[PDB]
């Protein structure tokens, strides 16, 4: 199931729009912010415990700081974020009802609108 994931968030990491976001903040520090914000929304979708869902996000927070320095990688940079969520969603079964489209077009869908639609700096919060 990681695999679905990292194909879209793989293009979604490497997005003209969302990769000049992740690239402009010139910081892996910074970049763990934009990741585990979009898992955010993709994990909301499925609830899970708000505790739990703490240290699920942090898997990916803390893969990405060994990959800081090479996060051009749309495909290593994704790599982590989805399967850090990838991981709990697995657990769960199969993602969505059943179909691995809905739920990545909704979870992708969040991202695309939270940064042009609103705009970049409007991801800062």
Same mark, same amino acid.
């Given at each position: 199931?990681?695999?679905?994931? #990292?194909?879209?968030?793989?293009?979604?990491?490497?997005?003209? /729009?969302?990769? #000049?976001?992740?690239?402009?903040?010139?910081?892996? /520090?910074?970049? *763990?912010?934009?990741?585990?914000? +979009?898992? #955010?929304?993709?994990?909301? #979708?499925?609830?899970? /415990?708000?505790?739990?869902?703490? %240290?699920?996000?942090?898997? *990916?927070?803390?893969? *990405?700081?060994?990959?800081?320095?090479?996060?051009? /990688?749309?495909?290593?940079?994704?790599?982590?974020?989805?399967?850090?969520?990838?991981? *709990?969603?697995?657990?769960?079964?199969?993602?969505?009802?059943?179909?691995?489209?809905?739920?990545? %077009?909704?979870?992708?869908?969040? +991202?695309?609108?939270?940064?042009?639609?609103?705009?970049?700096? +409007?991801?800062?919060?």
């Amino acid at each position: 199931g990681n695999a679905f994931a #990292q194909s879209l968030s793989s293009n979604l990491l490497s997005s003209g /729009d969302f990769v #000049q976001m992740i690239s402009s903040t010139t910081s892996t /520090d910074q970049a *763990v912010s934009v990741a585990t914000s +979009v898992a #955010q929304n993709v994990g909301n #979708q499925l609830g899970l /415990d708000a505790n739990a869902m703490n %240290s699920l996000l942090g898997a *990916v927070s803390g893969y *990405v700081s060994t990959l800081g320095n090479a996060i051009s /990688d749309a495909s290593a940079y994704a790599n982590a974020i989805s399967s850090a969520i990838g991981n *709990v969603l697995a657990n769960s079964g199969s993602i969505s009802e059943s179909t691995a489209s809905s739920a990545a %077009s909704s979870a992708a869908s969040s +991202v695309t609108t939270t940064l042009t639609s609103y705009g970049p700096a +409007v991801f800062y919060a």
